[PDB]
Design a protein around this ligand. Structure first.
Ligand SMILES: CCCCCC[C@@H](Sc1nc2ccc(NS(=O)(=O)c3ccc(Cl)cc3Cl)cc2s1)C(=O)O
Length: 260
């Protein structure tokens, strides 16, 4: 506890490595996002989709185009995340069918975690900061498509109140990926051993980075509960549309994950 020794040094090194890897794997960092969202960036201003009109001009059926755009991005997000996971010390030294498992059950949690970086009260940044689509507009979407992102915005405004930065999220995201309780893991003890290490790293990171804010570590770990709820409810809502809308197509790589 609050001791600058070899053990802590090693933990900071692990924080730094994770951070550096996160920057390399994740193009739109939270820091860039918040700049754009606060008008701080003197870089180019994004187009604001707030209605059907502004959706069209910006594009230069609706609900189904936007849904398919969310699934294409969902899939680049899985490539992004896969790369990161591989950078986590100990990850590639695991059974390739614990790697596939941790990523199968992990990706969606990470996706909604990081999506929060792109969100404020008003909406979400899209296409790497070139666009911004309003919360209320996503709601105005035809049923059932207007209920998908709503609960993410509810998650995001609470989560963003914690004021985590990329440093923090880097380690947090690792903690999630290495979750010791995903179905069908062969070698559970190694995964837990790495996560113990990450969890020490995160605790120390949070103490250093957040002097004013205590039980942040606690308050953060509880977010993993909210995340799993969100993913569950997301699947249930995807089950419905795959019934209601039995005419459109759902990318086959997501279907690989979703069915379990
Ligand atoms: C017209 C293009 C729309 C933007 C496409 C996605 C953006 S960012 C983004 N990325 C994801 C990733 C996942 C989700 N899942 S979700 O919130 O449950 C969701 C909300 C609404 C609809 Cl219609 C479908 C879905 Cl699945 C949403 C998003 S929004 C991008 O940069 O390309």
């Amino acid at each position: 506890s609050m001791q600058l020794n070899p053990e802590s040094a090693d933990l900071r090194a692990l924080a730094k490595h994770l951070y550096d890897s996160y920057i390399k794997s994740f193009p739109l960092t939270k820091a860039k996002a918040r700049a754009i969202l606060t008008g701080k960036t003197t870089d180019k201003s994004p187009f604001v989709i707030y209605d059907m009109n502004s959706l069209m001009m910006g594009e230069d059926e609706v609900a189904i185009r936007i849904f398919q755009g969310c699934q294409f991005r969902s899939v680049e997000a899985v490539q992004e995340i896969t790369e990161y996971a591989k950078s986590i010390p100990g990850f590639v030294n695991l059974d390739l069918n614990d790697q596939v498992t941790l990523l199968k059950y992990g990706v969606h949690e990470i996706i909604y975690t990081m999506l929060a970086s792109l969100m404020n009260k008003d909406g979400v940044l899209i296409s790497e900061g070139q666009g911004f689509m309003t919360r209320e507009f996503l709601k105005s979407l035809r049923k059932p498509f207007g209920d998908f992102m709503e609960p993410k915005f509810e998650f995001a405004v609470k989560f963003n109140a914690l004021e985590l930065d990329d440093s923090d999220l880097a380690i947090f995201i690792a903690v999630i990926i290495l979750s010791g309780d995903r179905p069908g893991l062969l070698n559970v003890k190694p995964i837990e051993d790495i996560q113990d290490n990450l969890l020490q790293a995160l605790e120390l990171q949070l103490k250093l980075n957040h002097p004013e804010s205590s039980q942040l570590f606690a308050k953060l770990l509880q977010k993993m509960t909210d995340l799993r709820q969100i993913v569950t409810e997301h699947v249930q809502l995807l089950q419905v549309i795959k019934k209601t809308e039995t005419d459109m197509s759902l990318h086959p790589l997501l279907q690989e994950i979703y069915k379990d």
